Amino acid sequence: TGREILEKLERREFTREVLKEALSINDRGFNEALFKLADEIRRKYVGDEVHIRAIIEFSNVCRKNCLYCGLRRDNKNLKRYRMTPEEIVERARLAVQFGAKTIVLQSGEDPYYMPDVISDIVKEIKKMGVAVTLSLGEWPREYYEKWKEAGADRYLLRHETANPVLHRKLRPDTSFENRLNCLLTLKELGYETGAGSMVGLPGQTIDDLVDDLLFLKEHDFDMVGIGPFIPHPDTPLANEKKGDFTLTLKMVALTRILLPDSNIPATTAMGTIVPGGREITLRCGANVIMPNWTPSPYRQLYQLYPGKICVFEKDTACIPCVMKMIELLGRKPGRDWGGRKRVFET
């Protein structure tokens, strides 16, 4: 029954059978109870602070050819850019002046920066007294080592999907096995480590989602980034169906349940498919938000949302925006860097 599954979740009887059934029920009441649960677990384990990770998308060059991704190398209908290192440090400084306690440096897999330019940049931001998160893709162990010694605190490397055949068809440059080795390496070197998947990928079944969850649980990732799949028009998946918001939201809730002291963002994709989607996610298990901090002209001063379309006046609008959001949700800003605090067990 709907009632019995919530009870198995409470006792942490996290079997394949239970996760599958929980993902299979579409009853509104069951869903609402699951979200109140995930929220209650979030309050108890990670508290009311909502942590801001300022994202600087500093280069959109990528060497890989992932099929879902607007940054894939075969996409010629994309203006490519690279910020200078100095532009980056100074932008970060501006973020820090605006209150950001974590800076995320993210890109396509762009060789130009790797490894030394990254190291020098990271060293420089760490002088600024903030946490540093990297999201640069798959690289040799030697690069992860240099960036860890350089002072990086965290690394996001979403696993996207745990079905290896699906992974290899979608990311023909690589494999799930390779992705797993990178995640493992990052964990062993002492990074705060983030994984996660897209939901509603073409060919992905509920069973695959179950496997994603079991995966996350198995490895105890510090962070889990989850969002719905959103077709990108300049890719081979332009014409595939979008991921469902409720289903993705349920993945987020379940993720909080499985990994109660972890950091779970309300991803931008979530705010893209449903109005108020980020806020909704934050009231359903999530405890982090990641505002775009990329400067013009790399970033249009234009953010589509459904119906609405936020036309901001300045480079810097989103940090104040999200602080305001956080305040209005009755949540609290982070007092510290908001890194993972491994409680709940042993």
Ligand code: SF4
């Ligand atoms: S490595 Fe990242 S940026 Fe490059 S195509 Fe794959 S998903 Fe996109």
Ligand code: SF4
């Ligand atoms: S300022 Fe606009 S784009 Fe930025 S987070 Fe707020 S509503 Fe969204």
Ligand SMILES: [Cl-]
């Ligand atoms: Cl990216």
Ligand SMILES: [Cl-]
């Ligand atoms: Cl990415």
Ligand SMILES: [Cl-]
């Ligand atoms: Cl982070």
Ligand SMILES: [Cl-]
């Ligand atoms: Cl996102």
Ligand SMILES: [Cl-]
């Ligand atoms: Cl992003």
Ligand SMILES: [S]
């Ligand atoms: S990435």
